[PDB]
Amino acid sequence: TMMSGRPGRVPLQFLPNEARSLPPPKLTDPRLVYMGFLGYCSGLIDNAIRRRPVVSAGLHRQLLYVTSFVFFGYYLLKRQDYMYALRDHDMFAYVKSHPEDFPEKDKKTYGEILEEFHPVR
Amino acid sequence: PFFDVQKRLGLDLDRWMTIQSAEQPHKIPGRCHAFEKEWIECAHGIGGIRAEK
Amino acid sequence: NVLQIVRDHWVHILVPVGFVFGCYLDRRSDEKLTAFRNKSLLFKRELRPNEEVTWK
Amino acid sequence: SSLLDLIWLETILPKTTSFIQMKMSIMVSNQKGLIKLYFLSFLITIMISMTLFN
Amino acid sequence: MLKIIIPTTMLLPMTWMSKHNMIWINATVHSLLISLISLSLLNQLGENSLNFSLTFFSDSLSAPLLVLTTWLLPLMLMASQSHLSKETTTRKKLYITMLILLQLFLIMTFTATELILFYILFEATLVPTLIIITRWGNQTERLNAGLYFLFYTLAGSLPLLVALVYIQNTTGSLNFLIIHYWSHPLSNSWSNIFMWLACIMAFMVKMPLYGLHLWLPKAHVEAPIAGSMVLAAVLLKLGGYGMMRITTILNPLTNYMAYPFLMLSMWGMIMTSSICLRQTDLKSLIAYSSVSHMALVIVAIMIQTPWSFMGATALMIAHGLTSSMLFCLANTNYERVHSRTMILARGLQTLLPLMATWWLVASLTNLALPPSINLIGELFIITASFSWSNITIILMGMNMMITALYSLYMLITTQRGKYTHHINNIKPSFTRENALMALHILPLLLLTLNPKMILGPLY
Amino acid sequence: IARTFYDGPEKNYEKTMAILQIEAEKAELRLKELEVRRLMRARGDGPWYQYPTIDKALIDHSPKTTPDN
Amino acid sequence: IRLQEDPDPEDENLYEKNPDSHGYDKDPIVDLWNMRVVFFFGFSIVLVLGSTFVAYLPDYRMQEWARREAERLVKYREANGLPLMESNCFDPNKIQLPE
Amino acid sequence: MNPIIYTTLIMTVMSGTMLVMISSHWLLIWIGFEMNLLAMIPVLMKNFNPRATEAATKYFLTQATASMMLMMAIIINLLYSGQWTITKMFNPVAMTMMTMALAMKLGLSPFHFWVPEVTQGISLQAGLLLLTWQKLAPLSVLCQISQSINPNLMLTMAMLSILIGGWGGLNQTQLRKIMAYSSIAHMGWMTAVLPYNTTMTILNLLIYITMTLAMFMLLIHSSATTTLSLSHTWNKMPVITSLMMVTLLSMGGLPPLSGFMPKWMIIQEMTKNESIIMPTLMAMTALLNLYFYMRLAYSSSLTMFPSTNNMKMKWQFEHTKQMKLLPTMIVLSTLVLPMTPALSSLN
Amino acid sequence: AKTLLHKYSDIPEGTECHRKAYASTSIGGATGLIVSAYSIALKPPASFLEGVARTGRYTFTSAAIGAIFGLTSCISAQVREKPDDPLNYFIGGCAGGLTLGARTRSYGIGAAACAYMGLTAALVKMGQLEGWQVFAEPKV
Numbered sequence A: 001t002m003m004s005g006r007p008g009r010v011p012l013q014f015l016p017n018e019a020r021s022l023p024p025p026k027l028t029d030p031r032l033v034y035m036g037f038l039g040y041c042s043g044l045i046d047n048a049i050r051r052r053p054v055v056s057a058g059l060h061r062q063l064l065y066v067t068s069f070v071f072f073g074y075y076l077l078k079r080q081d082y083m084y085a086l087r088d089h090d091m092f093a094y095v096k097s098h099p100e101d102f103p104e105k106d107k108k109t110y111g112e113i114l115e116e117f118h119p120v121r
Numbered sequence B: 001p002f003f004d005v006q007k008r009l010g011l012d013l014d015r016w017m018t019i020q021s022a023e024q025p026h027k028i029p030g031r032c033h034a035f036e037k038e039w040i041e042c043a044h045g046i047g048g049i050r051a052e053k
Numbered sequence C: 001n002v003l004q005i006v007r008d009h010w011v012h013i014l015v016p017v018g019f020v021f022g023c024y025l026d027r028r029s030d031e032k033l034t035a036f037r038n039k040s041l042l043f044k045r046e047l048r049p050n051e052e053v054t055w056k
Numbered sequence D: 001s002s003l004l005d006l007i008w009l010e011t012i013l014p015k016t017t018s019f020i021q022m023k024m025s026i027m028v029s030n031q032k033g034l035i036k037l038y039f040l041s042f043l044i045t046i047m048i049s050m051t052l053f054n
Numbered sequence E: 001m002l003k004i005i006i007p008t009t010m011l012l013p014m015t016w017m018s019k020h021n022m023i024w025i026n027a028t029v030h031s032l033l034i035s036l037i038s039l040s041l042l043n044q045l046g047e048n049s050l051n052f053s054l055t056f057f058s059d060s061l062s063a064p065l066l067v068l069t070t071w072l073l074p075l076m077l078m079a080s081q082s083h084l085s086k087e088t089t090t091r092k093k094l095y096i097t098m099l100i101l102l103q104l105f106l107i108m109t110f111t112a113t114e115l116i117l118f119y120i121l122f123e124a125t126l127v128p129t130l131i132i133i134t135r136w137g138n139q140t141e142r143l144n145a146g147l148y149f150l151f152y153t154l155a156g157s158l159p160l161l162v163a164l165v166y167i168q169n170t171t172g173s174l175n176f177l178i179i180h181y182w183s184h185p186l187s188n189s190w191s192n193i194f195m196w197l198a199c200i201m202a203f204m205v206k207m208p209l210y211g212l213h214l215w216l217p218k219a220h221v222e223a224p225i226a227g228s229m230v231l232a233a234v235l236l237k238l239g240g241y242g243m244m245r246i247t248t249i250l251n252p253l254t255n256y257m258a259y260p261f262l263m264l265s266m267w268g269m270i271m272t273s274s275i276c277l278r279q280t281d282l283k284s285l286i287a288y289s290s291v292s293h294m295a296l297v298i299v300a301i302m303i304q305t306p307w308s309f310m311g312a313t314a315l316m317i318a319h320g321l322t323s324s325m326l327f328c329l330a331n332t333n334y335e336r337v338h339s340r341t342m343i344l345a346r347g348l349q350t351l352l353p354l355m356a357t358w359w360l361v362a363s364l365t366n367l368a369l370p371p372s373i374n375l376i377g378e379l380f381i382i383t384a385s386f387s388w389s390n391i392t393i394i395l396m397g398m399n400m401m402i403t404a405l406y407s408l409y410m411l412i413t414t415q416r417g418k419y420t421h422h423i424n425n426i427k428p429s430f431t432r433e434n435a436l437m438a439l440h441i442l443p444l445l446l447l448t449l450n451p452k453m454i455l456g457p458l459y
Numbered sequence F: 001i002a003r004t005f006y007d008g009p010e011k012n013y014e015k016t017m018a019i020l021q022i023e024a025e026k027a028e029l030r031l032k033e034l035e036v037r038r039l040m041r042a043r044g045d046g047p048w049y050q051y052p053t054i055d056k057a058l059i060d061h062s063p064k065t066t067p068d069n
Numbered sequence G: 001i002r003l004q005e006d007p008d009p010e011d012e013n014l015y016e017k018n019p020d021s022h023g024y025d026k027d028p029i030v031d032l033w034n035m036r037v038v039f040f041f042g043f044s045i046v047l048v049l050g051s052t053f054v055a056y057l058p059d060y061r062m063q064e065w066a067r068r069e070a071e072r073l074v075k076y077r078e079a080n081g082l083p084l085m086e087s088n089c090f091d092p093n094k095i096q097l098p099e
Numbered sequence H: 001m002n003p004i005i006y007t008t009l010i011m012t013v014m015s016g017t018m019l020v021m022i023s024s025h026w027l028l029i030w031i032g033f034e035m036n037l038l039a040m041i042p043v044l045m046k047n048f049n050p051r052a053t054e055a056a057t058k059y060f061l062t063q064a065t066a067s068m069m070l071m072m073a074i075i076i077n078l079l080y081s082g083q084w085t086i087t088k089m090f091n092p093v094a095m096t097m098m099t100m101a102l103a104m105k106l107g108l109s110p111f112h113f114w115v116p117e118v119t120q121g122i123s124l125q126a127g128l129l130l131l132t133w134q135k136l137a138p139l140s141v142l143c144q145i146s147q148s149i150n151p152n153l154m155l156t157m158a159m160l161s162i163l164i165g166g167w168g169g170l171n172q173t174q175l176r177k178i179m180a181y182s183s184i185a186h187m188g189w190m191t192a193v194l195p196y197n198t199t200m201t202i203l204n205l206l207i208y209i210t211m212t213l214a215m216f217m218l219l220i221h222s223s224a225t226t227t228l229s230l231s232h233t234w235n236k237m238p239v240i241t242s243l244m245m246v247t248l249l250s251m252g253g254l255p256p257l258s259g260f261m262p263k264w265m266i267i268q269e270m271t272k273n274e275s276i277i278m279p280t281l282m283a284m285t286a287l288l289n290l291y292f293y294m295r296l297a298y299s300s301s302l303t304m305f306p307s308t309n310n311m312k313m314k315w316q317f318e319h320t321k322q323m324k325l326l327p328t329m330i331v332l333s334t335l336v337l338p339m340t341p342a343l344s345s346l347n
Numbered sequence I: 001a002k003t004l005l006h007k008y009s010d011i012p013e014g015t016e017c018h019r020k021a022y023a024s025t026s027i028g029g030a031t032g033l034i035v036s037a038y039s040i041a042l043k044p045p046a047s048f049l050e051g052v053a054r055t056g057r058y059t060f061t062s063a064a065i066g067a068i069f070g071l072t073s074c075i076s077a078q079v080r081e082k083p084d085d086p087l088n089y090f091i092g093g094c095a096g097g098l099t100l101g102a103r104t105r106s107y108g109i110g111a112a113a114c115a116y117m118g119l120t121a122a123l124v125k126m127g128q129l130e131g132w133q134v135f136a137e138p139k140v
């Protein structure tokens, strides 16, 4: 386990207060659209299993499927973006704190670099 | 795996019984209370790897 | 019978509107890769008097 | 056609592997469901894990 | 590439919402429109590819394959119309959905810009093909054919996934542009040998390679007409495209590891042509001819010279079109007499003149009659192989002779001679079948007129 | 045809430059992340891989029954 | 016998119920319009229009540009007495050999 | 069984698992395991018959032995450390005993026979609950004690589980035994990835639970317990057969379905740690699982087996009971591959 | 098992062929004993004598395979004077496979065992040379 045990981690918290400094996902996000598509597919499968007209029966429950999937997907995307931002922040902090472990290397141009040539014949 | 409901809600379900240097009835000390206290105070807050090392 | 024609031949617009939407999405994706617009060594150019972007 | 394609190319990769998998499946699933037998197997596994694992 | 991707995902709901008697018409019309739209990808540059976005890009190698797929879909729809008359509406819509999903996956596979997405889509193409074969095949052996196909492909491709994730961890990215610009030589060690083996063996099993090819006759013989058309024309070219893409990071080790595969491919050309000489089934003959042509493409890719990649691309396109046409002709003959035996029906030139003409043209294109793109690709590959070594000319010459032999043998057996007396259900050829053959054959001659569009990025 | 259906080479050129920049940055970040993860797991002096230890707040410092606790 | 199975039906001939059949559908009108749309779209639109589009595709491969540049370079080289083709692709002054 | 008693026992099983997952004390974790087993036995013995009684007896014997081994490991760890908190165990022998006890509870090889035995003995709902919950809990314990796990022993048990599951599924014909061997193989995958990334372990757990729920609920809907019984479903409700086919394809790891995501992530994580041979063998061995999945799919969806005459009365009548969250579990088990980066949320 | 593997690896490759064969025979005997114990536990013998016979057959087969592999590999390496070559291990593995086929009286089993055992022995030698690890320690 990598992230668990991080200092300042409040248990059983889906979104801490520091996650509110990040841009919230746009409502037109392709991931949100895919979540809504999954909800619509679940509604169609529900109609098919229960032996109802697939594309015309249960419009209210299909709408509820889509809405629930979009809601949960939005919150899941917020948490995912927060976790990735936290990972990048920790990585950059450690790189700053350990310059001898992450040193800069000399940049030699290809004119100076010697590389072997392997003919194709 | 480990949903820390005790830490989240401020409960003491088993943390009283976790160690033998905690609050004992009638203030009865453990056999190795001093050694355990020193080990805990050394290893607290530095992580498992650093605590072992 | 005009409603019946629509009720039966409304599926013939799906592919055209999908093509239009795909072109729109391609343009919208191209607008996100403008980091080096008018900045390449080969095509760096002074803008015309009535012009703001070299390409869209 | 017959010797290479229909016989030996079929024998090397797909037929030999299929035969091996079938034999292993029979060996694995041929158990009689006897608690005494597979608890003795549990004991042997326990002893092996305790001794030859360091 | 979204302007091509989205219309297929709109073909799906259109197919599922169209009327029961309009599904074929709508699917064919809109597939033709999508092919016309996809024709715009042929306007490739000369130095670098067309980078639409971070996910999709088009190259001079990807564009002809995309055009071929988008053109091949409506022909498969016509063949499905032919052989699925008595099916129910829902099952017909499911068949069309399988074809549409396969086309969409192929388009995304050809336009993918990263190796892992390429692998995901290239493995995603397995499901629709397996479903089509094992569900709408006509004979008992379709289940065995599906099992062989699926397990050959997966046993080939899983080490490719392991190698790809290892390469990403080692280098940083699997993006094709990055792995081309940041390419470094591969040392001659056991680990590099096994990574080379993983990638190459995956694509060779997909290709297929001689000795790893039994799944091809098994699946092509037992598949329905649309499945055979897509298996031979496009799905066989995934291995060639992958090899032409994956060999960027395998040099110079490819100069040392290519010998076993080159010998296998050349002797496989010879052996499969000889097998074609003595086949009692027409579909098996066509399948083994496909194997021989793909072995020639393997030789070109392995020798890996600028004159060999152009020949490889041209031969891939030409073989796809020719094999699709041959399978369509064989399917028409089968649907007339309900048997795949070649010597069962004869005198078909006396009974059906126009089909005899189509057979003649298809067999002439199969044996690489100049100036067809089949011959263009074969001649480029032969010249590159001659530059590589001077006995490959002997092997190519004998392969070409046997190819002409079996092509004209099947032509003479099916079309010429005395008609079978007791076969009295040979109805005149349908306008649908004639149009299918014409739409197969005319693009070949047009590409002969303009050959620079299918010679790859090294032109 | 060029005016209607296509664009100039500058658009594709600079889009390719931007894509290359993004992909190179991502590859560098992936390598750096792998190095950071390896070092953190090896040492334990970073925010990651902080396995739990016994809390010191549980210790009772009140006088006991015997002076030698 | 082992099953209550239907006998294998005889294959239907489209020409029996419709001598003018194009082979697309058993419905005459649907068959006729399927043939018409296939022929029109495929042959006319795809073949003719795509063929002329590909024929008149702009020269983005820069073949003519390369020819003109080669002519210009050849003229400049042979006018000044310089070799037509240089010995090296890059500059040995900029290249630093290891020593 | 009274409905109130049944729901009380189900809630007791869930409360025991929750106590195991929230307790920081080894005694409390052992108490949770004991409560879980005690409340689980009647659930197995709900439908009373000699086979169910035998399955419950075997399950009780196995779980009691595992609990005794786990308590012995706890006591041994207490002897050398004097600590009750569940952390990295301070004694290798105690760690080995704990690992063996948890493997026995999970069903990892060579402790696997009771899994198909009990699964065949008990009904479909009992098997579903057994697999899901009784694998949910010990995996939580293992994830908590991951940093002290012996990689050699853990990976040996995982590979043995994968191989045994593949071969058993190849040879079996009963649907419940096929599901049991599938569970064994997936547990092998999870425990193979366990010593490197508990996040990947949890992701595999979630995907496996979703797919198993979908498959078991489809089997309950079709009321089929054998291959031939399932072979008649196409003549009554062909939609269920197609959904079962796509679920079987997903469980085999075929892209672009949801089942490929756990295998893909596990392969990536293991190859990050310079491990190639184990991921290669694990990937190649799943072909046996896919083979028996495909063989099961041939008999139900891709072909039409002969039917009977009373199936006409079956057509005349209609299914009454409605499964809960069946469409959601079907969708989540086949169409969540483009949502893979949510494993960061799972982290 | 670790001690036996350490002894086998500590014995030099191209030298001390008798000791290398002894180490391989010990490893094979241990494997055969474990297999015999599992076989008796899972499939009970009819009688004690039959169980002893089965254990002896399995142990002798495994020990013969190990001894043949060790002897063949060490002798090949010594005569070719080319250590660190997977071909020696391949020859030893095929020899062990042929020994198994002779013990089971089956030409097809012998051929398949030769092929598979030679391949896996070559893989083991390549892993020893290149530093491949089967059970990798958690690193990242």
Ligand SMILES: CCCCCCCCCCCCCCCCCC(=O)OC[C@H](COP(=O)(O)OCCN)OC(=O)CCCCCCCCCCCCCCCCC
Pocket (backbone or CB within 6 Å): D004, D008, D009, E210, E211, E264, I106, I107, I108, I109, I111
């Ligand atoms: C890609 C193109 C295709 C490339 C690959 C083409 C195929 C190549 C391989 C062809 C097959 C070779 C033989 C493989 C199996 C050998 C074992 C075998 O066949 O066993 C079965 C049989 C059992 O016999 P049994 O039942 O006891 O009694 C009947 C008669 N006595 O056993 C017997 O009857 C035993 C008969 C043995 C006869 C001699 C066999 C010699 C050939 C095999 C060894 C070849 C070694 C090559 C080494 C090359 C090194 C570079």
